[model samples]
Target: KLVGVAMPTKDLQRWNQDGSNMEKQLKDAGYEVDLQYASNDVQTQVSQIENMISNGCKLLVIASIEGDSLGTVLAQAKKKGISVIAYDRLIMNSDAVSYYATFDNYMVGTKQGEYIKEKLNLETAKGPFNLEIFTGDPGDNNARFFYGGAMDVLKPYVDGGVLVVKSGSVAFEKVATAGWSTETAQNRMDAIIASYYADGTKLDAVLCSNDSTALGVTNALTASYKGEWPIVTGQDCDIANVKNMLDGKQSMSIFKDTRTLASQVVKMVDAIMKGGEAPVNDTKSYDNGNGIVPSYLCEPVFADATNYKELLIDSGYYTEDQLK
Candidate 1:
């Protein structure tokens, strides 16, 4: 009756909320929960998983630091007949993984792209506008899915000469931010601003994969850039990013409701413990190199100035005081 919940780190606010929410829901369901954070280290995560397995955890929910590093440790979980659910981030190349519970990650990117398009009035805007792109860690498989989904929406505009990549770093691999680090992103953005906007380039929009990267881009814009602030898109509506959105620094953030996702995972865990099928809405979308992992994906929504009050404040996801 023991369940292990592994999270990446507390560096990003969303992971902290996710870990707390999942732990509370699992405990409320009358199960013993052992939750741990890996401090964004793969070795630490592997060691934590080994400890959880040795401690006789019947089920393990893991949000991996790196998707491919857990194959060896998870093989041990398989030998012990332990069920592992890939939480948020898919653990690749492992048959030991039993299920996945996360938001529609690709859809998150698509929404970000569409928002930029709408904001720019791309269909009827007077002329081409400058754009830049940023993605997440290369080790995380979801990063590719996010980049691909956003590219799917924005590529046509680039091809038609309506949206210009000012830095000319259009490829996902080129623009990807390592570890999704804000410092790294800020340094890169600083370089981009120096190279492209030193003479006052008319930058129009920046497509940041998540709020962490958006924060970095915001820092660069505030420090050295002299042009008008561009339309920026982000994900995981972190408190800082929410404040930025309210202050007109960031344009929008995709809000993935962790409470709903935690409730769903608890339901899946209950069914699994009772010898029933875990609830899954997807059978084929996610392929973890071993095979298609059965998945349950929660829908994601975007929050901006117009609806932030209703979606975040009224729903109690965040308080007005927090944003202030």
Candidate 2:
């Protein structure tokens, strides 16, 4: 009768959307909902799950704060006969996880990479174009997927000298932003641009995993870069990022609508509550250190300067006033 939803934190707007959407849909589907945000603390998230399990939640849907921090707590949930669904972020090395619901993370990166390729004319341009990369917290598994996907497409060009990372910070550790902090990203990009581009070097682009990091890069570039605004990529379609896109401060962000993901997760919960198999399309990918966990991947599309009104405003994901 009760479904538990554990979101990582509300500091980010997307988590708020995901939490509220999940609570709404679960209630609409005739279940009591307990939605909690852990304020981005792993221990707090674990305690919340403990409470949810003890209170007799029939299902647990979690967007983990740290990918690998929940194995023991989730094992207890499994022992108590509660089904667990990994929402958005996969819980690693936990057999207690029954299913995963998320956007196609790798493809999200592929889209960003392709956007950089097409926008910069990487394929045909022989001249070396300066680039830098930024991604999210290293603790979150999704960061790796996003970075890996985008780099898979961009690395060849780097190897061939078509794209140049002038800052020489291409490895994941060097590029990762702690907690996806926009300020941290801004600070890092500030130093990178200050160190490498103060001499009139033209920076052609920056590859970012999500909107938070993109916003950081945009802020740094806005304040300092005298070069033509470099092509910047992002995800989550956060309001600030979208506003930046419309204002030509950014290139694009991946749109993985919360409503779509929440609806699918609710359906998955309802299916499980009815003692049936939860719907999943991808079974081979997402090996969470323990074994493969079934996943339902929502397709993601990008909203850029060319199609914001069509994809965002007209679709009612944001009102004109909201974006403005």
Candidate 3:
């Protein structure tokens, strides 16, 4: 039969990779896939899901633009007795969500924090290190997990005065990037640079939620500098960020391989359509407001200079020429 895959946007490179991979694997499994990208717009996404339902898509796989905005349309899917799988981003407040498939979002943050901890020796380093935070869109559900996991690891250091936020912009609301846009992040980092670090203040680290925002921070640093580049953390090892990692512009990035997630999702779709048990590993982690959504959480790893060749090149994630 037919399946519908609704991805969040074309703006982000990772979503494009996610969409095409889902399409290829679903087709390989002998199902017709109607994959649609929402251009980061909620209205367009809702209408596309409506088309999928009306046009007889047996199952719908959605990576929502905004987590809580899909309840009404998804209720329609439930009325028709169709199964819905929330892909990557957890769909909130909707009982219509049957299952979820994504990387361990919380662990993603801890890894970033851990990277920072090891690099800065937060456990034993003396005095204070200046830090700044730049997280993803407030609308994205995973932004909270990414911010929470890293902050939990870094909070003690802040409380101990081992780590200092010079901007005093640690809260999620204050630091969250509106669209995960590079421009937004660059602008904020620009201001922070001009205000605090411009006078040779020796900024120590930046906690960016993903590649796009990390790229923004990197651009800002490139444009103007006072001291050594800070250790920057990011996710979604997009090509540009990978190059940055190699060039010593970015400290590390969480390499959540889109291929790994796409392959798992195809298996989930197969089980759902065949009336078999859902291929879920975690049942207690993701609660989508209505109930705990059974989820398959893939492990995430960080790729840095020391391990880039082994993880990205040798693992077939990227060709040597691709990075060049």
Candidate 2 Cα errors over 4 Å, as ranges: none
Cα lDDT for residue 66, candidate 1: 92
For 46-165, candidate 1 gives per-residue lDDT tens digits of 999999998999999999989999999999989988888999989999899999999999899899889988988987886699999989998888898888888889899999999998
Query: In model 1, which runs have C-alpha deviations exceeding 4 angstroms?
Result: none
lDDT of 2 by residue, 257-303 (tens): 88999999988998898766788999987999989999999999887
Q: What is the C-alpha RMSD of each candidate to the true structure, in Å?
A: 1.1, 1.0, 1.0
lDDT of 3 by residue, 198-260 (tens): 996998999998999999999999998768999999998888999998889999988888888
> Which structure among the candidates has the greatest lDDT?
3
Given candidate 3, what's the lDDT at residue 320?
A: 93
lDDT of each: 0.91, 0.91, 0.92
TM-score, structure 3 vs. true: 0.98
Kindly give the stretch of ten consecutive residues in candidate 2 with the minimal lDDT sum: 270-279
Q: After superposition, how far is residue 84 of candidate 3 from its true place, in Å?
A: 0.8
lDDT comparing candidate 3 with the true structure: 0.92
